[PDB]
């Protein structure tokens, strides 16, 4: 997965 940080 990519940068999934909100």
């Amino acid at each position, epitope marked *: *997965a*990519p*940068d*999934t*940080r*909100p």
Partner: single-chain antibody
Amino acid sequence: QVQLQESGGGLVQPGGSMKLSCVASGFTFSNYWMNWVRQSPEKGLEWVAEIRLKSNNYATHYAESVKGRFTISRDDSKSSVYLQMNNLRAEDTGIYYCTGVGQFAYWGQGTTVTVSDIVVTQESALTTSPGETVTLTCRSSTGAVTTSNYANWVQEKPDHLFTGLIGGTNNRAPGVPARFSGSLIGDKAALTITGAQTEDEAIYFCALWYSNHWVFGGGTKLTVLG
């Protein structure tokens, strides 16, 4: 107000080298991956490189078009990301943007560089009018788009002004109007404007994630008539 500001572009000859810089403010820079994306003279967006966090040993990935020639780096103490470009080619000509956050929420103004196989498909153009519902779509040549492609939607307004609207398929970026929503519909990613407004006349790009790189679609020119 998050701000990204690129610098270092110019007018160079083939074979040369150039280093771009981007300084970030208004968010916790060190907690997010950063990317470079470029826009060529034929108006298309192309993802160039990403850099991950200190906790990922600053891992990097590149588009095959620049692998071995470009180097992405970052300095968290200066809130800055860099792109070293070697062996420049005419095809590297474009506007270079630094961008990141969920996953392309924030974009700088861009710095111009003039040097002198998955396909993502979007509708070339759609026409709507104020108050209508319009849905833009984003198809992958690999097969069905799923949540594992982490679809993003980005808006280009005049003068090369990019704003991320949606990331992770359906997560609206902070401050983005509620009329914008992301979905998956019939094996494609989709952006819906529920009640289009005159100011929504713009070019809309989707980007899809494939394990370790992004592919941007060709963009949809949305006209809002009346």
